[PDB]
Enzyme design. Sequence first.
Site, PDB file in Angstrom:
ATOM      1  CG  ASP A  30      -1.648   1.097   1.343  1.00  0.00           C
ATOM      2  OD1 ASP A  30      -1.469   2.338   1.937  1.00  0.00           O
ATOM      3  OD2 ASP A  30      -3.164   1.059   1.045  1.00  0.00           O
ATOM      4  CG  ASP A  62      -1.854   7.469  -0.365  1.00  0.00           C
ATOM      5  OD1 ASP A  62      -1.090   8.490  -0.353  1.00  0.00           O
ATOM      6  OD2 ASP A  62      -2.509   7.064  -1.208  1.00  0.00           O
TER       7      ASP A  62
HETATM    8 MG   LIG Z   1      -3.240   3.132   2.119  1.00  0.00          MG
END
Ligand SMILES: [Mg+2]
Lengths: 466, 453, 466, 453
Positions: free
Chosen positions: B27, B29
């Site tokens: 991931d 962010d």
């Molecule tokens: Mg995220």
Amino acid sequence: KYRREAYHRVFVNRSLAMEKIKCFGFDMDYTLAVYKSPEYESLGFELTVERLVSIGYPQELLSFAYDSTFPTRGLVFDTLYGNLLKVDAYGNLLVCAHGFNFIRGPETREQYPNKFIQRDDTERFYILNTLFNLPETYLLACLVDFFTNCPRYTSCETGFKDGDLFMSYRSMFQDVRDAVDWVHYKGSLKEKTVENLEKYVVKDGKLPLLLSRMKEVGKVFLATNSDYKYTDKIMTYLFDFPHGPKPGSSHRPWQSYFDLILVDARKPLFFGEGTVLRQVDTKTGKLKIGTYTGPLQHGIVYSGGSSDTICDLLGAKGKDILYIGDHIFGDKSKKRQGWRTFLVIPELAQELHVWTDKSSLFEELQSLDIFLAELYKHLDSSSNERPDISSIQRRIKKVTHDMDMCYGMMGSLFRSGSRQTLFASQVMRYADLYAASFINLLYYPFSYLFRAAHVLMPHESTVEHT
Amino acid sequence: KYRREAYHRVFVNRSLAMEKIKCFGFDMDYTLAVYKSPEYESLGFELTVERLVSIGYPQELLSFAYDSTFPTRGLVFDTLYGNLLKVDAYGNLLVCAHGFNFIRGPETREQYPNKFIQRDDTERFYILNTLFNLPETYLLACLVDFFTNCPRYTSCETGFKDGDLFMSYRSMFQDVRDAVDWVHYKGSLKEKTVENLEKYVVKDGKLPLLLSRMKEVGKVFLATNSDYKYTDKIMTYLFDFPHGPKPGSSHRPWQSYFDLILVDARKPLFFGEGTVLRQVDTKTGKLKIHGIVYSGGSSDTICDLLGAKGKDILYIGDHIFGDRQGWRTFLVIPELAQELHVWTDKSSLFEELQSLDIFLAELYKHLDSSSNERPDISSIQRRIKKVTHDMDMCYGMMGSLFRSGSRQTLFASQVMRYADLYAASFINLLYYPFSYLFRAAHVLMPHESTVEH
Amino acid sequence: KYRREAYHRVFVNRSLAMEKIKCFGFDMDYTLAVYKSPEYESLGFELTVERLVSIGYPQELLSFAYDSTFPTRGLVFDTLYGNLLKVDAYGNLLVCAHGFNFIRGPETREQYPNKFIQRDDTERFYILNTLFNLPETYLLACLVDFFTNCPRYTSCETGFKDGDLFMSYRSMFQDVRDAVDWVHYKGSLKEKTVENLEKYVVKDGKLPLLLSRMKEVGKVFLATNSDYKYTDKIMTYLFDFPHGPKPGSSHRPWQSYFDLILVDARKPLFFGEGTVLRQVDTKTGKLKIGTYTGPLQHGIVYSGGSSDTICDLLGAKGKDILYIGDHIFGDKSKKRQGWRTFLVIPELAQELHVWTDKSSLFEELQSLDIFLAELYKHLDSSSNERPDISSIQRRIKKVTHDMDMCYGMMGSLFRSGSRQTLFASQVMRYADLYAASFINLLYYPFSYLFRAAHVLMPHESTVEHT
Amino acid sequence: KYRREAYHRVFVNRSLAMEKIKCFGFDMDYTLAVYKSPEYESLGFELTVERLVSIGYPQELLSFAYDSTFPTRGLVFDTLYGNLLKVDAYGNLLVCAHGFNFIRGPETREQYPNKFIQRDDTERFYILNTLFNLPETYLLACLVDFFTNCPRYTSCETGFKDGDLFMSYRSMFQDVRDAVDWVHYKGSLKEKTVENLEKYVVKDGKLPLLLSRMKEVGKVFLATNSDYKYTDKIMTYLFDFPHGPKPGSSHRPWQSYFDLILVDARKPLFFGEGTVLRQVDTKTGKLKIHGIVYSGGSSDTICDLLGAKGKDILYIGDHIFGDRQGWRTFLVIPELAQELHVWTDKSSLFEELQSLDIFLAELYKHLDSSSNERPDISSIQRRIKKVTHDMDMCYGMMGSLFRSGSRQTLFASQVMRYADLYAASFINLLYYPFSYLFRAAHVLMPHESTVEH
Ligand SMILES: [Mg+2]
Ligand SMILES: c1ccc(-c2cccc(-n3ccnc3)c2)cc1
Ligand SMILES: c1ccc(-c2cccc(-n3ccnc3)c2)cc1
Ligand SMILES: c1ccc(-c2cccc(-n3ccnc3)c2)cc1
Ligand SMILES: c1ccc(-c2cccc(-n3ccnc3)c2)cc1
Ligand SMILES: [Mg+2]
Ligand SMILES: [Mg+2]
Ligand SMILES: [Mg+2]
Ligand SMILES: [Mg+2]
Ligand SMILES: [Mg+2]
Ligand SMILES: [Mg+2]
Ligand SMILES: [Mg+2]
């Protein structure tokens, strides 16, 4: 930290100040009246089998024998695939037995992708929670096993064929479900029990002691799903000692020990809208056509009603009431105030035994784990060592399996390896207090303050404060 | 038992043999790109507020200031009564704040009889799980406080009146929820961030070190919900050091650290049907009508392309999802560093409580159901209440993310459900070998933890 | 407009194209098997009373006699005040009888302010919809009447006292409710009926005629809540004529007339999730342990299941199915497609009779109303005439009361004065088609198109198009 | 049977003896003050649209034009699928329009299996009952049509995306509902109306005639939800003729026609607990800290002050309420005049359908269950469908307010429930004496209407 000894202990999920308890309420079946194991389970198992055969099941069933070392409470039956499943709080498979075949490991994912069941699907899966489900738990694994290995029947993904008749695991389970019910409701379980009470039902001289001490500090009631004729036979036996509250005191009847007696409660409906409150006629056993809408003034016995009725009659509301019982209800909830809960969990005595006389297996596991920590101690992401731990690994599997076998063949009621059972989590949800017997309240003052134990997350338990 | 240092530790819910991991998924962010606190939260808070004002909210909103010591993650907003609720794993209220008035005691049962909520009622309650809900958590308590205490407005059980214009909290909350969304999707949150990356985004010379070591032993992919243009700007900053993997090595571009790069993923749908897999043109930024960089697609697409099966994939991220084979999970929880700090720099408060508890055990030690003694313990009680209160305040004003008193939060229970592994940063993997075997800690029931062999 | 004659007519609420009907489904009790009145009602009334007395009700009850001219179907019992209420579609009181005392007029508002009940309160009010509720309808009015006028009991707002026992109207009604149930389920209603079928059950030579004609154009099934042993005794009798479909043709068994037979349906649960589909063993009556998951190939009899099962087995879905029955279910609804509905309403024959042999009373009322129109004809808001119409008024009350008395003492099932009953509105909700008997389908072709009648609002019916 | 003229008639659901009426109560808005159509609707439509744009809706909205031939009153909006539904008394779909696409046929069951809705689900469906919902009825179908057919937006089952900004119809509908509300309570609907009363509000020289005749035989009160300032302006215009009650008589002020005047009533709450009764200062317009004029209070207050009991009060109004004694009800339904017009100026279409139906009866006349005949009636069928379609169009595009085909609308059933009396205007009472006895029409079941004595 001073701690009472293990067999005498009440355990705390949510803190409770006993001084503020105004009423003690009691469940009868498997609470006040503890049925003897494996005697009682076997009796149910026999009557159920006999009921099944009489309505057409094969006669080989007549030779099954309830085996108390197979079932644990809280298993899940998959009516689609005919499996008994031990799962964790979130739905992960721990154990998966088809008949007496423990499917295990990788071959699980062909039926359970992600080794996971969607517990919410109360159409496919059926949780066997109650101590009355022990007989049918073992029995289900028996039938599946019988039909699987019997040549007159063809095994299929979801059931069995005979001719051009198909019997789904769902249908069979319904037969079983219906058979147990019948046995409790139209069958001879109740009468077989009362015809030989000392074989089936535990009795304990401290029971009157506790309840009479309880009645000195607050009100005490009985709220059972059984009927009066049965409750009476049972409550009479539980209280049949040559004395009363203590040795030396005269024998009082069991009704005398209760500010309020209620039967035919129809729990769980009881805790909601309930039924119409009625009054039992002690002589005949039948209900009086009229009741008695009056206040607490007792030689009275009630039937039906609701939990609110209890609160009206004793002039208490929920947080002031400790309810004592063997059954895990749900939710918490619906706008009326709810009682506090003491959950009786009989299996807890054996659970605690293993946790003590098998200290040897825990400290091996302790040390085996220590040992790994070392093999990896001076390593990080730069290092290329692939230390062989496959000898150590397989040793763990044997010590834990040997430990499991000590509980039963489906293992601990609460735990498997590191994981908690769905049962463990239902307890920690529904129960404020729990112990092997409610009698353990005998070893605590009514001024006692039960402080919840801290359930620690990994980062809490493996990290010190200094 | 040998244990690495606290801030460096990976914690284990379900055992995992790292040896058998074929891919690392990332991931971006709040995982690869950790936004600085409280700067980023504040930015979102302002941009959100300004949006609300632009669509008609009072101008008094324009002078709020995000206060990072109020919210903790995982709170529950009751749109019916307008309360922020901290609840336990099963739905029991722990903390209940209306605006900035913390209600709980007996006066709670007037609105929550049985001090209990049904998480099931998604129509009423909204769990604020994500680090992006931190601004709106605070904002929600601000608006309720404002409308409640502003004389231009009359307070009601389920909302407030402007004259006899009525606004339910449900309606207010949706506006707030919509404002945040707008800010992320049409607003200027992204551009104000890339215009000042050193103010908003953390960077660590160890990020290349880890990802390159990871690529030596398995495949590495990036699966982010952002677009390429943003990802590019973000991933470039994250890797912008005068060196590469280690000091002395030449700077490689960030695409080089990933066997597969995927944007516009649309998680959670990604993990289900997903979308049509498309291919991005780096040059244009736009989509085309090996050399890497996909848009959309599905988790299967990842598995097909790298030739892995679910159980062989470690997915690394900040978001707690739900639930055709599934990945193992490394959950990142930034707050854990501060959470652990309190658990350490406050030893004195813990062993007071410890000691205080011991003391009670004594006062009841030689007592049983025959005893008439009611030992007065109210000074002890009141002292315990204060020490835990002081302990809470170290966390924030909604207390610890994971626990409050004896009880675990709903947030804590979601972690123990969704996460196989968790830590403060995924960088802590730097401190363990890829031959490591993570063994789950045993979460004990009361009868287990208070009973010795 | 050509119209078949009244006793032969099927009436239409919602249009239906019969050509597009692929299956005819049948209810048994009070549909295929019409129980004789007042014979059958009386029998239930007797067995219920005998059940009540045996469990402790006064013995004066033993001398009650079911009176068929009191009850109408669809009345509402107020368990709080012990009233039988006739209400309109919206909850307005039309008739209010306490025992055999019709409270009427202004004295109603002391218990029913606004002469209105909140029908939704399924805790206070109980709708007596089914033809099985006829006995208990009259019986309830009897008990209330008995206890009211009996000196050993004290009348109160919500019940009666004897000693310091109170019997609420709610409790009494529960006894009654429970007594009827028992009589149908453990009692001798079923056996008393089959021991004298010609006294209790109508039989009609056109029944085979219709069903065999039906089977030539589409599939036909039986879905009853009764069990097989009973259904058989009943269906055998209904078909016991010296011939088959028509005079001259040989007698076929009743099973031959059905593409599908299902018993123990457990309607209404049936139309939802239902139960597990099982198969009955014709010889023994008990269920086979296995079933037959196979397609339609019939000598088979099913138990339980769901309405979807029917659709799977006949390969139809709802809008292609006409369900024929006496019971008004609800909702329309829940995502599966639902069947069309033919509601059988036996009382309709007497209802239609009054609507014809009492033409004299309607045209008086017609004219009396005409007459008023005149007395006010040339008046408006300026005029001060207060024309005395009190002689005319009271004349209306007598002609309508005399008309009411023709139906029963609680009046028409459908109407009272200008107003429609709650029953009338339930019919117009649930039923696409209705008639006195389903046999009336004999007088219509299977190509017939039923066109809904127009229910007109005041401004529609009192205003001409030219 | 003598019957007054159609446009002059009062219609009767429940019988009522006018002789026994002690008070006449009056609603003002859309009762005493009938707003002109389509002018007023259009004004609301524009003001609403402009409000929506101001808080962020596309500018394309600014060029919509209210079309009075689309909506009829009493439609049901499905916030889940974004449909306008015309349903019958029991919940059966009659008409289903998504934007301006009228769906119904088999393709309805894809969204409404069993072609049925549960009115119970106030969370999903919203009944648009009032004459103030006419603008938003049309507006809702406009927005759904616009977003559906605009290329800047992608259509979804439950809403639309702007990019991947998502807007549920539920959220849209609330905005629309809130916009109307805003317009009435903070907006300029009231002032734009009083600035041009002859454009917006009907006036009738018969209003004084009726109310004065009423005052000669019983008490007359005004109970309106408006404020005094608006009421004053409105009631003044309504009574502004060069004469009083009749031509030749001197002009009396409008307060003089009322024994009791009440504003800020807050119906429906008025009929329950109500508010604190207050007293208005005419001079100031503001409230004070016989000579008439109250604010707030309750229906009991009215009964106390005039010394009447519920059943003795005829309340006159345009609004259909629900349900300590209650009033009788005269319901005003303006659309009835046009509804009745079609029922008269279209005799030819009705007696065709009549005739067409007769014809069918013949084709099946000598047939029974033995017959093999399947007479082809499809040309008749198709002809019937067209004639009713043509008949519908005379009403509007959602057809008659009360009926569609054989069936009655949900609106029709609410009337027959809530209203003792109804007519197009309450002025029709001018044509009946106060000694009149209204006798209910008999609503017949099929077996009653198709069976003669
Ligand atoms: Mg995220
Ligand atoms: C999921 C949750 C717990 C565990 C676990 C618990 C205790 C020991 C071990 N273990 C795993 C490999 N060697 C020891 C695993 C494995 C999988
Ligand atoms: C639920 C959650 C935490 C607690 C709790 C935690 C620490 C101390 C105490 N306690 C309770 C009474 N005196 C101290 C209660 C009680 C109930
Ligand atoms: C409510 C509904 C219907 C009626 C009604 C019906 C038929 C006749 C009459 N009626 C009323 C006075 N004289 C005749 C009243 C009265 C009240
Ligand atoms: C529900 C509502 C109205 C209608 C309807 C009204 C007029 C004519 C027809 N009709 C139906 C088949 N051919 C003509 C049906 C049918 C069902
Ligand atoms: Mg029990
Ligand atoms: Mg046991
Ligand atoms: Mg996982
Ligand atoms: Mg029936
Ligand atoms: Mg009858
Ligand atoms: Mg109005
Ligand atoms: Mg009314």
